[PDB]
Design a protein around this ligand. Structure first.
Ligand SMILES: N[C@@H](Cc1c[nH]c2ccccc12)C(=O)O
Ligand SMILES: N[C@@H](Cc1c[nH]c2ccccc12)C(=O)O
Lengths: 105, 105
């Protein structure tokens, strides 16, 4: 039920091997301190700049998404911590509660 | 005499640091076996295929340029080796040369 032509299946295998040979070539380049000249040969100046900005875009997305979780958690905890104090205050004995009211001036 | 605006000089430094941060990020990704997913995040499918084909293009250029040097060298050596044999044959003594002609039947 695969339903794929031998031509398309051979091209997909070709692109897969060509991609795997590049990442392996780049890996050995880092191990030989040749990554910088290889990237200058493999990439255009506009593609190198695009990659540099995309890292910053990922950084701003992660920082933006994490900062929205922190305000979501701090606002929720600020409400959850009030309810914990309310329940604990209801459970306190009268001798403590009435003494707190006398220090409630 | 540099004659460059502070705006352009700051942007060139920004692109340089962004590019250096990417290659450093990719280096640590190879050391952490995270290169394959990082490249899938940083590159589009069309850009990954372009890089895979460019490696093959470099391979065919190097193989093509080297094969042209080998035929250039083999044709030149084939001429240089005939002249060496001609000179060495002129320098040979008569007793050898005349004996070679008697085995020249
Ligand atoms: N004894 C309280 C302590 C506490 C938690 N959150 C609070 C907020 C206000 C006052 C007290 C608390 C408790 O177990 O939950
Ligand atoms: N004695 C010859 C050997 C040699 C080199 N090339 C040759 C070609 C043909 C015959 C002999 C040779 C030399 O020193 O050069």
């Amino acid at each position: 039920m695969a339903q794929q032509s031998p031509y398309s299946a051979a091209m997909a295998e070709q692109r897969h091997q060509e991609w795997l040979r590049f990442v392996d070539l780049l890996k050995n380049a880092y191990q030989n301190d040749l990554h910088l000249p290889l990237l200058n040969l493999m990439l255009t100046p506009d593609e190198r700049e695009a990659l540099g900005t995309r890292v910053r875009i990922i950084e701003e997305l992660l920082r933006g998404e994490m900062s929205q979780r922190e305000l979501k958690n701090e606002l929720g905890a600020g409400i959850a911590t009030i309810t914990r104090g309310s329940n604990s205050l209801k459970a306190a004995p009268v001798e403590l509660r009435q003494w707190l009211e006398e220090v409630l001036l």
